[PDB]
Design a protein around this ligand. Structure first.
Ligand SMILES: Cc1cc2nc3c(=O)[nH]c(=O)nc-3n(C[C@H](O)[C@H](O)[C@H](O)COP(=O)(O)OP(=O)(O)OC[C@H]3O[C@@H](n4cnc5c(N)ncnc54)[C@H](O)[C@@H]3O)c2cc1C
Ligand SMILES: Cc1cc2nc3c(=O)[nH]c(=O)nc-3n(C[C@H](O)[C@H](O)[C@H](O)COP(=O)(O)OP(=O)(O)OC[C@H]3O[C@@H](n4cnc5c(N)ncnc54)[C@H](O)[C@@H]3O)c2cc1C
Ligand SMILES: Cc1cc2nc3c(=O)[nH]c(=O)nc-3n(C[C@H](O)[C@H](O)[C@H](O)COP(=O)(O)OP(=O)(O)OC[C@H]3O[C@@H](n4cnc5c(N)ncnc54)[C@H](O)[C@@H]3O)c2cc1C
Ligand SMILES: Cc1cc2nc3c(=O)[nH]c(=O)nc-3n(C[C@H](O)[C@H](O)[C@H](O)COP(=O)(O)OP(=O)(O)OC[C@H]3O[C@@H](n4cnc5c(N)ncnc54)[C@H](O)[C@@H]3O)c2cc1C
Lengths: 374, 377, 374, 375
């Protein structure tokens, strides 16, 4: 509902993609956003609908139903989707980027043919499992065991905070094969695999998050993803691309902030208010510029850990700040659950923690700068 | 649980008061804070308990059964209660300051004797109603014989659906045609709307009030007819001072949750409190806590001296409110994923804190007030 | 020099332009920056030099010696210039954009023929005089025959004492008209240069008009149409000027990064300290976001899109960020950062100008906030 | 004109009297030369005797030696009024009266205090404190030789360095808790000051390195015990921090002094933004005062904590810098000229985020303390 903004000239294809996703999001997602938050449940019908629109495999190969587009495209879809529901945006990102994109980049032809088509149609839901109760920030200290036994790897332990955890049919799981790390393709139907009950979160309540438990979970050796002991490389790259695409989550939240604020103020010319509005608009636009420039850079093949970390750092902090201003501009009404401003705040905060914290991002950028400039 | 902090030397009586309230808040209030947020309702049984401890009439005169203490004392009580549950704190503040203190300051002896005793014991709950959907207020009071008839609505009233006694501002003559009234829940033509569904302060019952030819005896005029603007202004100064201890208690709670976590959470082989960035974050929280406290206590003390503090009262609530919300965001940050779950109270602290940047006058209004007064005198 | 950062892929032409301008800047401007600041005087020889490089007419028509380039190119040139000396950059912006570009856009071909060639060669210096001590301007231009007679004053004029050609706004009826004024016109006089906190190499003065005769063929843009003329290119001015703060930010990293390796405390380069890494990260991210936003606005202008809000936005943003970054630069250097031996203090002093000169942050916020309704 | 509104803190008649006195001296005598001190890059030396005469130089010194015998709150108030007139004079004053005189008053033996305090208190002598070095891992050597310690090395960034007659100097008496503080006289052969530094601000505050080349120090000039220097240094830093925090206080008070009168007589929704900005300056001022005064009063009760001293200077220094930036903003073009003092307030304010230990160091100290306190 607030649609002014700087044109970035992303090209006809991406403009069409934007108009498409925006139409889909306003018609099919936005009406369910509040309900998803209130019921604490992802609206499952969206999986196939997004599959049918080609959003789920947007950066995956056209062999398997994918659209073969790039990270700028993915950012735009993620932004429109998150604009309608940040929760659906987060689940979508975790499926389409965390799971699908890692398989597409590190998977062998046989593996991709086996797992991708259903992930891309939305028949299967995907997840990525890296974090553990005692290994979050310090992720390489993970303790999930994977012991070779015949033509199988037996998995023992747990993962935590997994987006789409209770629903995922296919998961990319990192495990210690030598306490070092290996990535595995895990099916929900593998015996010894279980999901915990969904978490009760401050925000992202439409997004089903759970622990995972592995009790003698047998994984075929042909389901290793990217080679034994080479899980850390796979992980690292996975974090880069995660960072760029997920930074569009905050973008969508910021767009939603203006969506509620501007019409509100037009149904309800004070100067402090106009200044507040200006700061929101300018922030939104700068954040867009930065994220799109980083995404285009990734598409040209200049992926730097620095700038991906930087754009999610920046966008996440700005989205939270702006949600606070959205509530503020609405006043008392903004403090009620009758308006979505509160939910925008609750949702936005996740991005300063998930995908690595602000602290970890700042440190990565600092250490990297210092390392390359010596 | 986190008890580091600057000693402000408030004296033995205030130190003892802090000890009593802290004991009550930790033993009684904290274990039901989550429940209050979840059920979206005030735990009514607390009223009489707070009544018993002498907290509800803390600034009311001893002649009417109050404790006869001042705003510094009241800030301290409000802080310790808010630290345990910010919802309970807001309700308490609205009862004991917005209502009880307005009556203590402005009431004739007979109004005070009629209304104060049950408000002080907690048999009665109290509220204050000023704000409307549209001091250009529209609530109308017309004379009818020896009574006043009230017509209109008030919005966003803390303790609204439960209040037995209300201080209500109304137009008797449409500017300097405002009058304050003591209203009883019992008066016909008075009702409360449904309770609000809020981001935070969910344990604090809030609603609109609807006055439909509501009859108020002329003897219930509070502070003289046409004089409502003076009663309202003064009320606002004291309201801001006492309510600013709400953000203080929330800040204290941020430290309570974060500090034991910094010790107990290990990553990279170390408690995360040993990492430079986290030490910095902690330092900033601590310094902010102490500065906010210093400012608020100084303003309250000035009030107890009977000094002017309009700018300074607006200022200490502006300041505290903004800091508390910022600090709750950092508390969630410091706890990480755990801090993003409802199993931890950090999220609740954030949701509750934001209230004070709107409720009881917004940040914007506080800024404009302060700047205007400066630019004049 | 710190030359790392996001690639924006501006194209071969702009990249070659950046390279040439940077070579010129480090060779000819940078060694004079301190001296310009200490003597409070523009190094005049730079005019002809910049004229020889085609920089003064970068966005002006080729038929008059201009480069015929656009605002993105101009921002890049302005950025590389300001990175070597902010004062030189400010004077350069006033000459090449505020004066030359206004003539190029609103000047009749005869006027451009008369005034542009020397401005472009650098034989003449250009200025813009709009601001007055008090749309409430009081400089009056009275039509007496084939002449307009100018009486009044203008204030804070960049290149004031040196300008040969000035675009000058005046009230012809209280209503506004822009004029081309020559230094040689009798009744025109410049006041002594101001003594400023920063931008000390940039010669600012008041102007005084006492019965100054301007011929009617020197009306710029049409009688009573001065406000359209002004409004136009307040925008382009904002875009191009926002590259001043960009140059300064680049300069901040230019001084901070090397120092973070060389300085050692507690047995380590200070760059290994976590708070330091945090700070450097915030600087880097800010630099990239600001560049992204300014380049996007400039490219929008070059596509001929309207960008009132976004031009005001990008200078608002970039000016505030540059000042904050200069502060951190001083911080990162410690005691040394506090001495005039290092350039950090100068960068802070210079940066503050852009929040307060050529508009103010408050005006920019109100403008954006009003145009966004409200 | 001056801005004199603000929250009353009820500091008592003695302190209110001191405040009126110093504010009179500051606006009458110091303010008119603040720009001169800045432009000439030189402390106005004649101020020393005058501040001695007003009882300001030994404000926390024992009365038996001529001092006022007042405390840290009192000292903060004096520092604040002085700094409000000229931050440079305030920094030189702070270094003399707290960094030097107070260290001697707390750690000196009776004979040491008798010998050195009287001329420092009357302002006949200028005092300094020397601890920092270009490289507590300092390199300044003090080798015991007979009944004298021989000093070799250098100190850097010393306030009042070129002028100091008496300096408290820290050195390593054993490169293995091997630190000792010393009372050093300018008159000692082998001691000299370097050229005065050329600084962004605090330009009226003379700052230099010190150079000790086989500088002979009498062994009776050991301050507070051989090897005990780390203790002396640390406590010195706590009190340094509390009193110097009033430097930023004075700078903030100056910001309002320049802004509020200007905002009246200047006339063009930017003015509402302006009122908001004025509100934030006012509130910030009052908050910082409340905190600094609370920490100082705590010190006067005998409660000194590393945390709170560090905290109040961290807070105040950051606030003063931000407010100076706003003062310039509020005065617009005029604020950007050297004809108004706002530019100077900014340049000066920045110093307090570095000197006395950077904001980074303060944050770490506080965090490490809290962590130790809550394990
Ligand atoms: C909604 C949600 C969805 C998620 N989805 C997924 C998923 O799909 N896949 C997946 O693998 N994981 C997922 N996670 C896990 C997520 O990545 C973790 O929450 C986070 O990365 C790990 O932090 P933690 O929760 O262990 O907190 P901690 O790591 O304990 O952090 C606590 C605090 O300490 C700070 N800190 C830690 N180390 C340092 C240091 N060295 N220096 C300075 N400060 C430090 C942090 O900044 C933080 O403030 C999800 C989490 C959430 C909340
Ligand atoms: C928990 C809670 C308890 C409350 N309890 C009581 C009570 O007991 N008694 C009572 O009388 N009231 C009470 N209120 C009312 C409360 O004070 C109002 O909600 C608050 O003052 C804001 O009113 P509003 O919702 O109409 O905001 P609005 O006034 O609609 O605010 C809209 C936005 O515009 C801004 N704005 C408005 N006017 C201007 C202007 N002139 N210039 C610049 N900006 C402007 C505001 O900052 C705000 O961001 C309570 C509110 C809350 C939230
Ligand atoms: C280095 C430099 C170079 C310059 N070069 C040029 C040039 O080449 N050409 C040219 O025309 N001008 C030039 N200027 C003028 C410049 O645009 C002004 O100095 C400034 O942008 C406008 O503010 P002011 O100086 O008049 O101060 P004021 O506008 O008086 O500022 C006082 C404060 O009040 C606020 N305020 C300002 N106006 C209003 C209003 N109408 N209503 C409410 N509040 C308001 C502002 O936010 C400001 O913070 C230059 C200035 C500088 C410093
Ligand atoms: C005007 C002035 C007057 C002075 N007067 C005196 C005086 O009278 N007596 C005296 O003894 N000294 C004096 N000093 C020196 C002052 O104490 C030092 O400048 C300060 O203690 C340290 O600054 P530095 O130059 O050593 O910076 P550095 O130590 O080189 O610091 C460089 C940067 O690294 C950062 N850093 C360093 N260590 C760490 C860490 N462990 N973690 C994170 N970040 C870190 C710092 O924050 C800083 O940003 C004075 C200085 C000035 C500027």
């Amino acid at each position: 509902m607030f649609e002014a903004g700087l044109n970035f000239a992303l090209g006809e294809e991406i403009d069409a993609l934007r108009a498409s996703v925006r139409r889909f999001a306003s018609e099919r997602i936005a009406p369910l956003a509040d309900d998803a938050d209130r019921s604490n449940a992802f609206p499952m019908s969206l999986w196939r609908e997004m599959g049918e629109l080609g959003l789920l495999g947007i950066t995956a190969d056209e062999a398997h139903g994918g659209a073969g587009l790039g990270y700028l495209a993915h950012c735009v879809a993620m932004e429109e989707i998150s604009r309608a529901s940040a929760s659906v945006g987060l689940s979508y990102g975790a499926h389409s980027n965390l799971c699908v994109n890692q398989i597409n980049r590190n998977g062998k032809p046989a593996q991709k043919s086996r797992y991708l088509p259903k992930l891309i149609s939305g028949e299967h839901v995907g997840a990525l499992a890296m974090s553990e109760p005692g290994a979050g920030s310090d992720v390489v200290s993970m303790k999930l065991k994977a012991d070779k036994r015949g033509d199988r790897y037996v998995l023992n332990g747990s993962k935590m905070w997994i987006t789409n955890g209770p629903d995922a049919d296919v998961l990319v799981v990192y495990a210690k094969t030598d306490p070092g790390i290996t990535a595995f393709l895990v099916e929900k139907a593998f015996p010894g695999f279980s999901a915990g009950q969904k978490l009760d979160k401050l925000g992202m309540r439409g997004s089903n998050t759970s622990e995972l438990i592995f009790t003698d979970c047998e994984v075929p050796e042909e389901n290793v993803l990217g080679g034994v002991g080479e899980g850390v490389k796979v992980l690292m790259s996975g974090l880069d691309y995660e960072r760029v695409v997920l930074s569009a989550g905050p973008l969508g939240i910021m767009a939603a902030c203006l969506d509620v604020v501007v019409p509100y103020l037009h149904e309800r010319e004070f100067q402090l208010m106009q200044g507040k509005l200006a700061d929101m608009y300018v922030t939104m636009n700068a954040a867009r510029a930065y994220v799109y420039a980083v995404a285009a850079a990734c598409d040209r093949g200049e992926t730097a850990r620095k700038d991906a970390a930087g754009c999610i750092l920046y966008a996440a902090e700005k989205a939270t700040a702006m949600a606070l201003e959205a509530i503020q501009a609405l006043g008392g009404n903004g403090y009620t659950n009758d308006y979505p401003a509160g939910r925008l705040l609750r949702d936005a905060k996740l991005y300063e923690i998930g995908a690595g914290t602000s602290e970890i991002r700042r440190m990565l950028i600092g250490r990297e700068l210092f390392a390359e400039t010596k």
